[PDB]
Every structure is written in C-alpha cells, then in structure tokens.
C-alpha cells in the first residue's frame, strides 16, 4: 500500500497473508470463514508451496496463527494474459480461531451489493505490499480508503482491457494505491459499521501513477462461485 495508514489494533481483522517457504509474505487474502480464504488466482503462481498467516499486523513480531492449505480452488477461466477471472478460494487444513485481529469479512448478497455497496463513494483496500512502486514489502499492515471509479473513466484510462469481472478504485493523481504484494488482499466496503467483501486486489499499471487506477476483481461477479467453492 502506497500512502494510507497503518491498520490499528482490530481494524483489519479479515486480512490474511500468504507466506512462502521462507516465511515471507508475497500476497494477501481475505478471511471468509473459519476454513476459507479468498485470494487472487494470479498469486498461486508466485510460490510453489505456501501457508496462510492471520492475526499479524507486524511481520517482525509474534494472536498470529499459521495455517496450511488443504485445497486450492482456482477459477478455471483465469487467464494470465488479461487477469480476467482473477480469483481463488483456499480451504485450510485447520480452522481459524477468531479473536482480536482475526475475524471474517461478510459476503454480501449480489443484487444488494451491486445497488448499495458498489454505489458507495469509497471502499478500503489493505495489505503488506510495497509502500512505493520500487521498494521492500511492508512489515506493517496498511489500509487505504479508495474511491470507486466511474466505469467509463477507468476504461478510458486503461492501456489494458477492463472486463465485467473487474472494477477500478483509487485516485487519478493523488499518490495512494495498492501495490506489489497487496494482490489477493481485501477490498471491503463499509455499510452501517459492517464491512463487506467487495473486491480482490488484482493489478495496476505500476503503483499510484498519475491517470491510472487500481484494478480489482469484482466479487459480486463470483458470489455463487464462492458459495459453491465453500460447500465442496
């Protein structure tokens, strides 16, 4: 996350961090329930073997719990060429114990999310990714309020295709955005003090570049797919 603020105690409890063999974070995820994590399908190529860490806000200090993955459920239509269908669900081997800094984000109903959540002014993106386009992964969990961007405006700004499975959020020139290592992490939208999962950090042309926005997987497009992935 470029810009934004540090997540304070209890503020981003649905954040998950995918960590490699070296125990280094390389992508985020969103806690959906005691057994399930939501992430980006493209993250599944950035490590051969990985585990999921929850409850950690500071990677330099041990509420945290490390969970091994039992089943990886990647969307069969994910394409490396456009990042279309950038979504995966992880079933963990052991259930997550909810506590301070560890709790699931709510999954909304589709129509209502489209009419009520996606129409809000802003959502919140979070992660342990880079804090500058060129830089080291953050050791602290960060979050950032990101305005929803007009669908036409973001297609116009984009050098790459923006499908119906994607949406744009962020700022035209202000220097704040998700960045490398934030992929797979949560985009949530608050409604009456309840936070709903609305996107998955997916891609961007660099980080926080003038006239470019962050691109996120549109969770409303996959609610049935997610529901189905959690039942089997």
């Amino acid at each position: 996350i470029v810009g934004g603020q540090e997540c304070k105690d209890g503020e981003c409890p649905w954040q998950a961090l995918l960590i490699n063999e070296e125990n280094e974070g390389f992508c985020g995820g969103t806690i959906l329930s005691e057994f399930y994590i939501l992430t980006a399908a493209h993250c599944l190529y950035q490590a051969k073997r990985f585990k999921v860490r929850v409850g950690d806000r500071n990677t330099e200090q041990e509420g945290e719990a490390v969970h091994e993955v039992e089943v990886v459920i990647k969307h069969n239509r994910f394409t490396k060429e456009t990042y279309d269908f950038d979504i995966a669900v992880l079933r963990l081997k052991t259930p997550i114990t909810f506590r301070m800094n560890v709790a699931p984000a709510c999954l909304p109903e589709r129509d209502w999310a489209e009419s009520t959540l996606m129409t809000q002014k802003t959502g919140i993106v979070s992660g342990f990714g880079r804090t500058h386009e060129k830089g080291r992964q953050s050791t602290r969990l960060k979050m950032l309020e990101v305005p929803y961007v007009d669908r036409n405006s973001c297609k116009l700004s984009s050098s790459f295709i923006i499908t119906q499975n994607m949406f744009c959020a962020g700022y035209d020139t202000k220097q704040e955005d998700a960045c490398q290592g934030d992929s797979g992490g949560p985009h949530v939208t608050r409604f009456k003090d309840t936070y709903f999962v609305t996107g998955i950090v997916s891609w961007g042309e660099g980080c926080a570049r003038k006239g470019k926005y962050g691109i996120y997987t549109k969770v409303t497009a996959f609610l049935k797919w997610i529901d189905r992935s959690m039942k089997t």
Binding site: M100, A105, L107, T116, T194, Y195
Partner: protein, 52 residues
C-alpha cells in the same frame, strides 16, 4: 426514493422488495431481530465487525 432506495428500507444489512414492501435479511452468523430490520450477531466474532 421509496422502499429499499429510501435509506436501505431501514434495514441493517440486506434489503429486498417483495411485492410492494421491504423485506430485510442478514449475512451468515446474524439473526434478523424481532423488528425485522436489525441484524443480531449469533455469537462472538460476527463477520464484518472490527475487533476494537
């Protein structure tokens, strides 16, 4: 603005229009309150709540 487009039909969470009236509902781990509008957490650590 009428029904669900009027302040979410006074619903805490989901709002749907069935026939010509508001029907509220909640996410998993919540129960609809007696008033048919509020959502009550069924236990600790309901989804979507900061743990402050």
């Amino acid at each position: 603005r009428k029904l669900c487009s009027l302040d979410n039909g006074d619903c805490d969470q989901f709002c749907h229009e069935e026939q010509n009236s508001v029907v509220c509902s909640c996410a998993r781990g919540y129960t609809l309150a007696d008033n048919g509008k509020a959502c009550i957490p069924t236990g600790p650590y309901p989804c979507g709540k900061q743990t402050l």
